[PDB]
């Protein structure tokens, strides 16, 4: 129900932090107690021991598979790629926003979209998603309704794709679901659990499927590097600002993800 307060009156941490990290960082660090020293640092900042976790993913291609997010505060570090701007952006969207959705099945149904905030998610080892349009008597356009090869392509054996096609028209899809999963998902709103930091060059990042709006939100940030330790130290001795740019969760509940506190 609606609320009430007053402006004439003024006002006179123990949660859990998530620091994911990529590999090449680790293989360049050359230490195993690095975690422990960093932890001692945070402890000097007062955040108690064990309140911090560390996770290592092999590469962006894999790590994009069903990302887990198990702190009420999540910060993801992302490398740069000279050609993988698009998939970096797909991950950026998947982790930056909250997706409420349903599991599909292309082999038995015709699907569609209804709103500018509805897209199709394709996650797995490798997917080649092909779409073929339909009319109001169920005959395709420029693709034949029995051939996979005539269909149009949007992704081939990619790890992840967030595709968008014209709403309001039924389609046929091509993929071997023996290789990955497909979710028809609506963007419920902004997700505040995650701050993404690009370690390197130019912020390609675009977090919405419109050319008219390309917002540089306060969560998609950028820093350059030659030695990872300085990066981690920027991460830590700025952690108050990083935590102030983000906020706690906002959503009631997703489909039962793991959440970890101590």
């Amino acid at each position: 129900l609606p609320i009430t307060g007053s402006m004439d009156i003024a006002y006179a941490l123990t949660s859990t932090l998530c620091l994911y990290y990529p590999t090449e960082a680790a293989t360049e660090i050359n230490d195993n107690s690095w975690k422990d020293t960093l932890s001692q640092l945070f402890l000097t900042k007062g955040w108690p021991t064990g309140s911090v976790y560390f996770k290592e993913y092999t590469n962006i291609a894999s790590f994009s598979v069903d990302p887990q997010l198990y702190c009420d505060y999540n910060v993801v570090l992302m490398k740069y790629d000279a050609t993988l701007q698009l998939d970096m952006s797909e991950l950026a969207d998947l982790i930056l926003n909250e997706w409420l959705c349903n599991p599909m099945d292309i082999t038995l149904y015709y699907y569609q979209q209804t709103d500018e905030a509805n897209k199709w998610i394709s996650m797995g080892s490798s997917c080649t998603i092909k779409v073929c349009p339909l009319n109001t008597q169920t005959l395709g356009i420029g693709c034949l309704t029995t051939d996979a090869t005539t269909f149009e392509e949007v992704a081939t054996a990619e790890k992840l794709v967030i595709t968008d096609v014209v709403d309001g028209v039924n389609h046929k899809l091509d993929v071997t679901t023996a290789t990955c999963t497909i979710r028809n998902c609506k963007k419920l709103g902004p997700r505040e659990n995650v701050a993404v930091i690009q370690v390197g060059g130019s912020d390609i990042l675009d977090i919405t499927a419109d050319p008219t709006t390309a917002p540089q939100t306060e969560r998609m940030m950028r820093i350059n590097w030659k030695k990872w330790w300085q990066v981690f130290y920027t991460v830590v001795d700025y952690v108050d600002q990083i935590i102030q740019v983000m906020s706690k969760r906002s959503r009631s509940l997703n489909s039962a993800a793991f959440y970890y506190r101590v």
């Binding site: 082999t107 038995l108 149904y109 015709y110 008597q137 169920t138 005959l139 034949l144 309704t145 029995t146 051939d147 046929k172």
Partner: protein, 692 residues
């Protein structure tokens, strides 16, 4: 207002006869079958589909005349052809002077080994024959189309003959001779209208056909093919005749998560086209009679059955839907082999089948009947052309009959089908896994209805759609639900009274009142009873205000429908028609004229009085006659006696009596909620009288 429904039940009678017309055109063939030897059963036509060149049927008394029928390809000179006729190979000299149609010769041997004569020459395109051997006479057809009458012969034992058909047949009742003949002189009726579409044995012992709602959403891959018919033609094979589409049956086997499915499915197309490679009238030159190629204006039908814990419930069907997918039918190329020269190639062939709905049907097994499903599909052309090599046609699209199986052992369609089915259970469990009184029912259930709610319902006019949405059953029947109800209503006795009054009024334009109307058609009792019985049409004629009796009638009827459920989905019309007439025969009508009120009832009670005091005043017939002719009429839901009682027992307003005369419902329900035994008395007396 509440009775406007009746006017609706009377308006669209015309629409009725359309559907019957639709039913009339909806109104089939019994067959075909695998040919057998038998006895023509009493009073049945044997209709015969001839394609194989030559003899068809033998008929012998074994002592008396022996008759046979032979079909003959065109373009055949005088040649002594050999045929096993009557069971013996005989040579007979036959030509075919016809070069535009096919010949039919009736082979008559007055004895077993006597002389043989050719009779009944028939020059036919439709390729059809028919026989009857009944009523002490032999009816076999003569005269070319369309004058394909039947001639009559007579010889003993009209009741024990064997018929030996070397062509497939159909059984027909006598009563449809007009169809029979019109079948013969107009052509094959559509193969889809047939009962035993696929070639099969002659078994005919199969079936011909509270609550709970169960869903069945399952996944099928139908496997189907096409079945060919190659009938060559005359000469030395220098002309083929036809290559067309015959109904096809075929089984297969697959999985549904372990529980494995064995299924039988059948294909049949409808509406193909007949091209031609019209060669020369010359004897020896390649020509076609008809090429069979389907166009996207035609259709295809697949008929499906198996057994399943799910599928065998499909008789009482609430809803049926399909969301199947479209599949390519790639054509094979027909090899020709002409007696000489290079052979032509009928190459190509490409189409696609697409989903356009589904209903229920009744396939036939070699031994049994099947609760089968009918998936109807539309077509789409596909790029790879048909080509007709060494010959004069290119750039064709569609499906040829060359090799629709194309070596493909079958075609498949993988999709989903959704069934909402009903099942009878006496409670909320014990669910099955397969498959007069009503008068007293209404009369009993009546005794508990409410009064205020009754009139409340009568204030919302009942109309066509808002009548029967309170009841739902098999979607097959409800397609004709208001249809059949009106079908009977147009034969209601009340409608007949409407017709009498109508034609009478018409005849008026060329008694009691001051001028002969149609309405002024101890004695005063009789004249009044006449007027009162006759008046009941004015309400149906929308000449009322407030409510009328028949409004309450429609109300109680709808209630009787909703509360009980023992009735049949097929029994509504009877009930509504009966209730329209029989209910409330003791009705009263009142009419007002400037402080002069008159009330006449069917039974013979008549009253007249003033506004304020309601004093008993004698009745003048001439006043009633000048009055009730034109001005609106008022349904005396309240009579004069309960009105006088209401007067003596309670103070009444000017508003009160004034509106009560016109009987607004408002003041009525008002008295009711005030809990007065008198208006409740009157209303309940109205209602409890409603017995069938």
């Amino acid at each position: 207002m509440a009775s406007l429904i009746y006017r609706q039940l009377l308006t669209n009678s015309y629409t009725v006869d359309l559907s019957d017309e639709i039913q009339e055109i909806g109104s089939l063939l019994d067959g075909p079958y695998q040919p057998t030897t038998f006895n023509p059963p009493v009073d049945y036509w044997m209709l015969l589909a001839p394609t194989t060149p030559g003899v068809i049927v033998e008929g012998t008394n074994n002592t008396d005349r022996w008759l046979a029928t032979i079909l003959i390809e065109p373009n055949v000179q005088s040649e002594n052809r050999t045929y096993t006729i009557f069971g013996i190979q005989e040579q007979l000299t036959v030509s075919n002077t016809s070069q535009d149609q096919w010949k039919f010769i009736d082979v008559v041997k007055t004895t077993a080994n006597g002389s043989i004569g050719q009779y009944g020459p028939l020059l036919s395109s439709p390729k059809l024959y028919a026989v009857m051997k009944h009523n002490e006479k032999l009816y076999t057809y003569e005269g070319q189309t369309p004058n394909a009458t039947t001639a009559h012969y007579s010889t003993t034992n009209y009741d024990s003959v064997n018929m030996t058909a070397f062509c497939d047949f159909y059984i027909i009742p006598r009563s449809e001779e007009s169809k029979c003949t019109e079948y013969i002189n107009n052509g094959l009726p559509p193969i889809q209208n047939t009962r035993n579409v696929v070639p099969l044995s002659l078994t005919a012992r199969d079936v011909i056909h509270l609550w709970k709602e169960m869903q069945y959403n399952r996944d099928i891959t139908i496997r189907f093919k096409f079945a060919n018919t190659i009938i060559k033609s005359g000469g030395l094979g220098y002309k083929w005749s036809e290559i067309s589409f015959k109904p096809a049956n075929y089984q297969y086997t697959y999985t549904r998560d372990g529980e494995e499915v064995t299924a039988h499915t059948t294909c049949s197309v409808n509406g193909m086209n007949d091209f031609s490679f019209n060669g020369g009238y010359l004897p020896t030159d390649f020509v076609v009679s008809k090429f069979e190629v389907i166009k996207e204006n035609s259709y295809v039908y697949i008929d499906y059955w198996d057994d399943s814990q799910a599928f065998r419930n499909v008789v009482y069907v609430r809803s049926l839907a399909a969301n199947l997918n479209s599949v390519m039918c790639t054509g094979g190329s027909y090899n020709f082999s002409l007696p000489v020269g290079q052979w032509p190639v009928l190459t190509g062939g490409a189409v696609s089948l697409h989903s356009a709905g589904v209903t229920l049907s009744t396939q036939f097994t070699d031994f049994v009947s099947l609760n089968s499903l009918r998936f109807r599909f539309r077509l789409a052309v596909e790029e790879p052309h048909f080509k007709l090599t060494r010959t004069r046609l290119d750039r064709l699209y569609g499906l040829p009959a060359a090799d629709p199986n194309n070596g493909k052992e079958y075609y498949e369609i993988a999709g989903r089908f959704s069934l909402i089915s009903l099942v009878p259970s006496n409670d909320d469990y014990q669910t099955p896994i397969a498959n007069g009184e009503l008068r007293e029912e209404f009369n009993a259930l009546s005794q508990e209805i409410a009064m205020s709610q009754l009139i409340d319902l009568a204030l919302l006019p009942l109309d066509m759609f808002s009548m029967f949405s309170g009841i739902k059953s098999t979607i097959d029947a409800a397609k004709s639900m208001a249809t059949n109800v009106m079908k009977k209503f147009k034969k209601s006795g009340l409608a007949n009274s409407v017709s009498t009054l109508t034609d009478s009024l018409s005849d008026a334009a060329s008694s009691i009142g001051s001028s002969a109307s149609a309405w002024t058609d101890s004695s005063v009792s009789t004249q009044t009873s006449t007027i009162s019985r006759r008046l009941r049409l004015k309400e149906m004629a929308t000449q009322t205000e407030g409510m009328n009796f028949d409004d309450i009638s429609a109300a109680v009827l709808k209630t009787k429908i909703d509360k009980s459920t023992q009735i049949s989905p097929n029994t509504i019309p009877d009930i509504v028609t009966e209730a329209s007439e029989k209910f409330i025969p003791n009705r009263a009508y009142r009419v007002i004229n400037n402080d002069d009120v008159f009330e006449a009832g069917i039974d013979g009670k008549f009253f007249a009085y003033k506004v304020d005091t309601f004093e008993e005043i004698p009745f003048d017939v001439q006043k009633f006659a000048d009055l009730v002719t034109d001005s609106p009429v008022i349904s005396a839901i309240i009579d004069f006696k309960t009105l006088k009682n209401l007067n003596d027992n309670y103070g009444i307003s000017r508003q009160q009596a004034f509106n009560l005369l016109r009987s607004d419902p408002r003041v009525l329900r008002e008295f009711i909620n005030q809990d007065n035994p008198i208006i409740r008395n009157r209303i309940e007396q109205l209602i409890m009288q409603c017995r069938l």
